Ligand binder design. Structure first.
Ligand SMILES: OC[C@H]1NC[C@@H](O)[C@@H](O[C@H]2O[C@H](CO)[C@@H](O)[C@H](O)[C@H]2O)[C@@H]1O
Ligand SMILES: [Mg+2]
Length: 362
């Protein structure tokens, strides 16, 4: 069970059975800002269970994240894949993504279940409205005060520092470095550094130039998230070597994000250019291979169950409707991407041993 391997996990799915309504599966088709194109594409909310906001279809179907048996299954599948850490998409309580309802109320159950399959839960901080250095302080405090004592709570166990929480911060670069440095530098007006609420803060890098913004901000590490090689400077794995090298110079944790392919045209029909075909695993493997080159401190996986963007490694089946031929992992099985992960996880987990300065040889 590899604890240096992280996977981005979403809890925002709902169905009538458990939530009393469909959530996220019944996703709207997001309109192009230019309506003179929006009108040449589908419109409105997907009407599940047959029609969902996804180019693939889950084994569990139109499932509820509030369904213990789903959480259980999910944990089990991550375990099969030998992932130790799920990076849970998080919004503050009474707050939600624009296409969902709130999901902090669920976290207690997700931890209990992560614990039950001896898995760990770190937090993937979404860009909630008015996110800044101030409410971030209030939320870190809430998160550790609320979930720190839970034996599922993830802490990067520094070989010989303190065991430190990790916070992945999605679209960090939105908040100016001056503002981050209030919270993330030692002498910042609201610094949690050297405090009971200190952690390892991970910033999304997009453009080459975000490097320097990230240093000025006070962040401990960087992650790329994006599954589409070519989309951003970060998500392009040819760049990854330079980001490792930079991260080494400035004592930053370089966490590359590897994805098994990309397709989001169920909800962003204009977004074809970033579609990547899975090539039955070849994409995913070239991604995980390029990540291992760098000899990274952790590796992140985009994603377990981002179904809208088609980055999910979770078990998916073939399905056909009156009008839709859903994609699927055929020729191979529902578990294909869990096995490709288990494979490369055990390879990473092993290779990572030879890295440490203490474990070198004559
Ligand atoms: O986890 C970070 C990032 N991942 C990809 C998306 O899930 C993105 O969320 C936006 O896009 C989804 C559709 O892809 C949409 O449901 C949501 O409301 C958006 O916030 C997310 O921030
Ligand atoms: Mg150290």
């Amino acid at each position: 069970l590899n604890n240096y391997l992280h996977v981005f996990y979403y809890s925002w799915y709902g169905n009538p059975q458990f939530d009393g309504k469909y959530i996220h599966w019944n996703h709207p088709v997001l309109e192009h800002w230019d309506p003179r194109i929006a009108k040449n594409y589908p419109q409105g909310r997907h009407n599940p269970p047959d029609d969902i906001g996804s180019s693939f279809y889950p084994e569990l179907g139109s499932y509820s994240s509030r369904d213990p048996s789903v959480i259980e299954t999910h944990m089990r599948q991550m375990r099969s894949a030998s992932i130790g850490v799920l990076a849970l998409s998080w919004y503050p309580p009474d707050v939600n993504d624009e296409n969902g309802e709130p999901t902090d109320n669920l976290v207690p159950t997700i931890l209990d279940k992560a614990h039950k399959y001896n898995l760990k839960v770190t937090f993937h901080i979404e860009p909630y409205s008015n996110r800044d250095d101030q409410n971030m302080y209030k939320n870190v405090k809430y998160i550790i005060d609320k979930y720190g004592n839970h034996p599922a709570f993830y802490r990067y166990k520094t070989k010989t520092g303190n065991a430190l929480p990790m916070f992945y911060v999605y679209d960090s670069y939105i908040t100016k470095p001056e503002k981050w440095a209030n919270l993330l530098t030692t002498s910042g007006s609201r610094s949690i550094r050297n405090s009971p609420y200190d952690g390892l803060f991970i910033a999304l890098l997009v453009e080459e130039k975000h490097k320097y913004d990230i240093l000025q901000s006070g962040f401990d590490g960087i992650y790329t998230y994006f599954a589409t090689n070519g989309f951003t400077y970060g998500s392009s794995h040819q760049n990854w070597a330079s980001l490792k090298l930079f991260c080494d110079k400035y004592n930053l944790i370089f966490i590359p994000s590897v994805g098994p392919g990309y397709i989001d045209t169920s909800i962003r029909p204009w977004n074809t250019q970033n579609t990547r075909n899975r090539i039955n695993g070849k994409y995913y493997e070239i991604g995980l291979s390029a990540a291992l080159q760098t000899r990274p401190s952790l590796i992140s996986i985009t994603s377990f169950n981002e179904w809208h963007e088609g980055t999910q490694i979770e078990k998916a089946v073939p399905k056909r409707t009156s009008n839709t031929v859903y994609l699927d992992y055929r020729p191979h099985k529902p578990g294909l991407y869990l096995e490709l992960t288990r494979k490369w996880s055990e390879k990473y987990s092993k290779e990572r041993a030879t890295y440490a300065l203490d474990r070198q040889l004559p």
